[model samples]
Target chain A: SGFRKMAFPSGKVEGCMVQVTCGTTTLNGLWLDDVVYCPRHVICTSEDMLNPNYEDLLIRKSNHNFLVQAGNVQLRVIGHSMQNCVLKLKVDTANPKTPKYKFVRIQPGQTFSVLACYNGSPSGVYQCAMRPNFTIKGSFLNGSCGSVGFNIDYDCVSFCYMHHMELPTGVHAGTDLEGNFYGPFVDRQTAQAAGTDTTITVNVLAWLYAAVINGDRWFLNRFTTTLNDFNLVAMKYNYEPLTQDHVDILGPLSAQTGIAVLDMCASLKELLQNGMNGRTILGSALLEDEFTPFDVVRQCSGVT
Target chain B: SGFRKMAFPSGKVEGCMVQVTCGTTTLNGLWLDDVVYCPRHVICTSEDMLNPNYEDLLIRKSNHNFLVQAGNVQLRVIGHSMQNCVLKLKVDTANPKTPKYKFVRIQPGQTFSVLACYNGSPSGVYQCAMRPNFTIKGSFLNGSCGSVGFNIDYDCVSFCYMHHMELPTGVHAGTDLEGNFYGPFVDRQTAQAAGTDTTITVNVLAWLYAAVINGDRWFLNRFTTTLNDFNLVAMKYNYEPLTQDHVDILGPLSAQTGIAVLDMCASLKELLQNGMNGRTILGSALLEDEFTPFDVVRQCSGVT
Candidate 1:
C-alpha cells in the first residue's frame, strides 16, 4: 500500500510544540494530544474518495519547524508521535516542580531546538538542543499524548489510563488491547519488525483521527471497514475482534467511525446486482482500467 | 501478515440447504452474514501475543469438493477459499428463486454446483447425486452470505454494505471472511488473479476484525495504526483527507465514552528520556514490565 505520514493541520503538523530561545522567552500550545479524541484538522480531499485503494489514506503530520536545530542548545523531543501533545516539557533541571511554568506554544511547520535556558517554555515533546534535562507535567494532567489516540482506538465506552498499553512507544502505552496481550518490546522498531503490527496501528489511528477532528462521518462507510480490518487481524493474532467491543464501549459503531473510505467493488454491476445503489465511489484511477472496480466516493453512507 | 480460517462451529457449518431426487428433504441454516455483529465465537489466539509479526491474522475458509468436469452434468463449484460463503450459486439452473431455493447450506469444509440443485441428500454441498435443495429465508433475508463476515466487518452502527469486496484468489483470500463480499470464480485460476485485491483487503480487514469481536481492546490498540496506514496510501494516491465532512454529516463525535484503556506513562523519567514506555498490553506475555513504569489500575477518570 502506498502510504505517507498523517497531516495534523495542513502541509504542516499540529503536535504541541514549545520553543525557548537562549533567554527566558517561550512559545507553545497543546497539540490536543491529551484533550482531543481526534487529531488536528481532517479534510476529505482524497481524489479517490469512495473505495480508496491502498494509496488513498491520509494523516496529520506535525513538522518540527518550531525549532530549527543549529548551534543553539535547544530542547529536543524524546517520545513517539502522539507524545508531543499531552506531555508538557521544559528544560528546568533546577526548578523541579516550579510555580507558574509557562505553557509553551510552537507554531506548525518551520523550526526547532535551543536551551530552556529556562524561558517559561512548557509543553509538548521538547528538550534543549544541547540542554538535556527534559521534564513533563501533563502526563499527570490526566490525558497523556499516548491516550489521545487510545480514546478513539479502543473506541470503548469505559476508558481508563491506569493500565500501561502495549504500543510501548507512545505516551499512551497500555498493558493490553482487546484482551490480547502484546509485548515488552521496549521500542517501536521491534514492534515495527513485528510488521503489520504497527502498520494497522498508525493506519487506523489516522482514519479515526478525521472523524474526531472534523467531528463528522463523511468517511464512516470506509472508516467502519478499516475498523473491521483492525478487528479482523486482531482475531487472527488471538485478540478478540475489539472493534465491535469498541462500539459496545463507545456506544454505536456510528460514533466510532471515520475517514478516507475505499468501497472499490469489482464493478458497479456487482454493486447494483447485490442491491447496493452506491456506484464506484472511491478508488485510484490507476485501477479503473484494470480488473479493479474502483470508486472514490468522497462521502459514502449506509445507502442500501 | 500470517492468517488462517476459523473452524466454523468447530466442525460443521451453519447455512441454508435443500435436497432433491432420491429424497425430499431440506437442511439449512443462515450463513453467518449480516446477522450477528460478532462471529459465533471470537477467540483471542494470535501467534504473536508479544509483538505480532503479520502471520498472526486469521480468516474463515470453505472448501468445494470439486467433481472433475468429465461430462458429469453436475453442479460444479470451481473455486477455493472464501467463495463458498459468498458466491451464492444454484446447481439447478432450472430451479426458480422460490419453491425450493436449495438455499443450499454447504458446510465450511466442503461443497457447491448446478443451479440451486436443492441438493439435501444429507447436507453439505450436494449436487446431481440425488441431492436436495436446502432453502433459506435468511439467505434472502436481505443480508445473508454477505453478512457472514460483515457482522464482524461492518461492526459499525447501521452499516450499509457496498461492492463485492474482492479478496480474490490469493494467499490473502481467507477461506471465509466477515461474509460481506466473496466470489464463485469457481477456479483457483480465477481466485488466483483476484489475489492482490483480496490480499490487501484481507490483510487490513484481518487487522480490523479483532477490533470488533469478543468486544475486546487488543485490536483497537493496533487497529487505529492500520487505518492510518490506509489513510497514508490514500493521500499518496490523491484522496485528500475527506473525513471532517463525514463528521459534519454524522453530527458530533459523540457524547459517548468508556472502558478498557491504557494511560500508563513509564515513570516520568523514562517517559521524557528513553523515548518509550507505552507497551500495548492486550496480547500474550502481558507486560506489566517494571517501570513498565507500569500501572494497570482500572476505572480511569477522563482527565481534563
Candidate 2:
C-alpha cells in the first residue's frame, strides 16, 4: 500500500513502486497497491520446470473439457499428481503430432498420454515441446520430454505372439545378390518374410519415441540386460531342455532393412532398455509405465 | 578310380575302401562303391551344415498333401532349401505346447512361418533348429532342433509397437499392503491408490518377461524413442498398427507385479547380436539387417 504507480506517456505502467514528476507531496497519500497482470494460461515461467509428464499440450484447457482429441491425437486427464499436476492421456494415443512441441503444465506423478505414434517431434499430428524451454533441438519422434513413453497399437504383442501378421505390404519385393529389385514373387513371398524379423526397414528408434511419449517403459528392459533370460523363455516355450541361453535372430532383408523375431523372448528382451529423459532417447529402459526410483528399488535383487 | 570295396556274404556294403572276408580273397569284381545305409530320416549331423530351410519333415513329402493341420498345430512344407531341407511349418498355430521345440531348419533367406503365441520355450509349435549340430535344447514355443534357431512366432518388433495386449489372463490376484489378498479395482479407492507414481513392486522386470514371450520387440523401442515414424505408422489403421500394443497393463488385481512390453527386445537385441551362439548376452549394434562391415563398406561415413 505504500507504493504508487504512474503511467508513462508511453502507456508503460510501473507497479510495486512509484515515480512522480510532480513533487514529494504528489507521492504521499497517492500510496497505491499494484496488481501485475499475467496471462492466466501461464503456469510455468521457466523451461527447467520438472515433471515426469513434461510433454505439454499447446492450448490451455478450459479446465472443464477434461478429455480432448484433435486430429489423430487425444489427450485425457487421468487425474492429478501427488504434486497436484494433472495427468494427461491414459487412452494409449499419447502422441498425435510428433513429441517435440508442447503447451502444458506438469509436475511429478502426473502422466500425459498422446498417440502412441509420436515421433518425438511436434508437427501436424499435435504440438508439444521437449521442455517448457522448447530450446532443445528435437532428434526423436516421441518428442524431447524426459519421461514420455509409448507402446504399440493393436496388441502388437498378441499380433506378434499369437498370429503373425504377414510382412508390411509392399515389402514383398525381392532383391538380387547385388540387391537388384525383383518381383514380390510366390504371391506368397510374404511367407519368406516372417512378421517378426525386421527384414523390412523401420525407423525403429524414431518409432520407439512414439511409444515413449505415451509412457512405454519396456524400451530399456529388453535391450540392456546382459543375460540369458530371453533365451530361457524361448526354451521354455519350445519345450526343449533349457540351454544356458538362446537368442532368436533374423537376417536383414538388406533391400529395405527389416527385422524378425528370433526367439521371441530373446530379441524382445534386448530391445527394451534405454536412457530417455522422457520421450527423448538417451539410451532407454523399460518399466510398465513412466519410471520412478521406486521401480529401481523393486528389482534391486529379486524385485527388491 | 583309386577307391574300391570288397563284398561280404550279406550282399556287401560300400564306402571309401573296405574289404570283407567271406569268399576268401577273390575280392575285385563288384567294386562296391556304395554308402549303402542312409538313416532314412537322418537330417543334419554337424551344426554347420548349410541348408536353406533345413527343418526336415520326419515323414517324406507327398506334395499332394503339402499342408497338414492337426489339433491346434499345422505342418506344411513350403519348399526345399538349397540343401534340400524341407521347410517345416507354414501354419499359424506354431505353438500348441512349447516354443523352443522345433522341427524345421532355416538359413539365410529361408523363412518359416508359425503362429504368434510361443511361450518362449519349446514343446509344440513347429519344431526345428538353426544349426545342424542339433545340440541345443528347445524350450521355446517356436520348436525344437538339434542345433537349430527357432524364432518365437509373431514379430517381436511388431509386438513392441502395436496395441498392448492385456495381462496373460491368469496373471491376476491381489496382495495387500500387508501382503494379504484382495483384487483389482476400478474406483475411488483405486484413485486413492493412484499417484504413488507406478511404484512399489516386483513389477519392473518380471512384467517385461511376459511381453517377451508374447513376442514383443521394439517392445523396448516403443519405450525408448519418440518419433513421428511410429506415429504415422500408428495412424495407418488396423492394416498397419494392428489392433493395439494393447496391454491391459495392470490386469492382475495385484498390489503390483504387473507386466509391460519391454523385455525380449532389449534382451533379444543383445542376444541376436551374438550370432546364434545361444542367448549369452552381447554388446550389439544395429543399423538394420544385422549391421555388418559390409554395411560399413556400402555407406562409408553416412550409412556407415
Candidate 3:
C-alpha cells in the first residue's frame, strides 16, 4: 500500500530505506521496523509483454534480465507504465547464508532491550550488524551496512513471509474455495518422491498473505477449470480434448482411469488455455506473476 | 484496508455485502467482485486475555466458543477495543461443500461475458448460482443467498486464499532472509511421512502476500531463536537443554547426534518460548495470527 523511506542519490531520507507503491509502480525496499530486508534487488520496465496488468504479474516480461540474473528480487512490467528502471537498490550483501535481520519483540511480562547496530566500523569494513544476543534462522547478522541502523520497538502487524518453496508434483495441495490453507504437506508418499527433491527452503509466515496471493489466483483458476472440466467430461463422453503432450506424459496416471480422466480433459484445453499469452508450460508464470516463491508443478502419480 | 458493502438489518446495500475494516475491527464479508466468500462466518470480541494486539493472534482465549464450534470463519479478540460482537452476520448455508463463488476475468483478446445469479427460485429455496460454464475446485456454485447478485468486470488484484492445511510436522519449509517463498514441498520424503499423510489441499497463489504474512512472523522469531540457541548450545556443551519431554520423544531422532543436536536445543526454549503467553504447544498461535492456512510442523526425517 506504499510504505515509504527510500530516497537516495546518496541520501535524502533513511528509516533504513523502503518505498513500495503499486499501481504506477515503485519498489526500492529494505526496511527494519516494518521489517522487509532480504537479498535485495528490484526492477521494473514495460514496453509490453503481450498484456499483464497487476504489475505484469511478477517477473517474465521477457525474462526481465533473467530474473535479475537468477537471484530474483522483484521485476515485472506490463502496465504500459510500469517503471522503476532502477534508480538505486541492490543489496544481497554477498550471501554468507543471509538470515539474522531480526526485528524481535516481546512484551509478555515487560522488560527487554537488545538494540545493536554498526555500519562504518565495529572493526572497519562497514559492519552491517546484529547479535546483542539472538540467534538462529541461520544466525548471520554479519554485515551489509549502507550505514547500518537499528531499533527496538514495534507492532503494526500486517503479514506475509513464505520466503520460498518449490513444491512441484502435479501441484494443488488443498484448501481452496477459501477456507485458506494449502500445504503442510509432508505427506502423500513424500510427494510421491519426484525429482530426488531438493528445493524446500524455510521461514514460513502468513496473515494469510491473501491466502498466499490467492493461491496462484485460485490455481490458475482451477488449472483452467480443470481443463474446462476435462472438456466437458470429454464432450459428455464423446472424447478428444487431452493433449499437452498427452497430459504431460501420463503422470498421476493422468487422473487414473475413466479414459485416463478423459486423457486429462483432452490435454487441458491447450494445456491451460494456450498459456495465457505466455508462461504456463507448467511453470504457471511462476504462480501467475510473483508473490515470492512457492513454485508449483508437481507431477507423477501424486496430487490427485 | 477496510473494503465496504455490508449493511443489513435486512436492508439497503448489496454489491453482495462485504465490509472488512482492520483497526477497531469490522469484517462482515462476502464479495464477488474483489472475490472473497467461503464458509462464511466472522466473529470478533474483546474484554482482554493476557494481551493480544493483532486481533489477539487468531484463535484461543478460552476458545472463543470453541472456535465457533469448530467451523471457524475468523474469530479473535483482544485489542482491548476489538468488536464485531455480531450485529447480523452469519452465512454457512448448511455446508454442501461450498465453492463456486467465481469472479473469473479474462482480457487476453477481450470478448467475454457470463453473469449468473440466484436467490429465490431456480427451483425455489433461494438459489445461489453459477455454471455460466466453469468448473473444478469441486464444481459447486450451489446456493446460499440473501438475494444473490452478480457481475463480470475486474482488475483490483490483492490476495489471500489458502483455504486450509494442518501440516503438523515440526514446521518450517524454507526461504527466509526474505526472498519470500517457503513451500512447494511434495518432497523431503513426503515430509518424512508422518501423521499418515492426508492434509495437502490445493489452489496455491502468491503475489507474495508479504511472504505469506512474514511466514509466521519469521517462524515465531526462528522458533524462539532455536530455543535460545538451545540454551546457548547447552551451556557450551556442559549439557542440558533438551526437554519438551525430551524433544517430544526424540522425534526425527531429535536432530540426530551431537548430543542429539544437544537434545533438540534444550527442547526449544520451553517448547517454543513458553507459548508466547498462549497457544504454542506447537500450533504457533495458528502461525502467529491469521493468514489463511499453511499450518506448519512436519517433524520426522523431513525438513532437517
True contacts kept of each: 0.00, 0.00, 0.00
Number of the top lDDT candidate: 3
Q: A69-127, model 1: which lDDT tens digit per residue?
A: 21224434332122311222222122221112122222111112111111122111111
> What is candidate 3's DockQ?
0.02
Q: What lDDT is reached at residue A190 by model 1?
A: 31
- Tens digits of per-residue lDDT for model 3 on A1-304? 1000111011111223333333333332333322233211122234322232324354433322322111233323222222221122233333332223442332111111111112211111000111111110110122211122222112121111111112232221211111122234221223322221211111000101212222222222222335556656445433334445434443333233223333323333343334334322211221111111111111110111
Candidate 1 per-residue lDDT over residues B171-196, each given as its tens digit: 11212333332333221213234321
Predicted complex 3: CAPRI docking category = incorrect
The candidate that achieves the highest DockQ relative to the unseen native structure: 3
Better of 1 and 3 by DockQ: 3
Distance from true position, residue A268, model 3, in Å? Answer: 7.8
Using alpha carbons, what is the TM-score of model 1? 0.19
Give per-residue CA lDDT, model 2, range A95-156, as digits (tens): 32121221223322211121111111111111111111111111111111111211121111
Model 3, B1-304: lDDT tens digits are 0000111011111223333333233332333322323211122234321232323443432322212111233323212221221112233333232223443332111111111112211111000111111110110122221112222112122111111111223221211111111233221223332221211111000101212222322222222335456656445433334345434443333223222323323333343334234322112221111111111111111110
Off by over 4 Å in 3: A1-35, A38-253, A261-304, B1-304
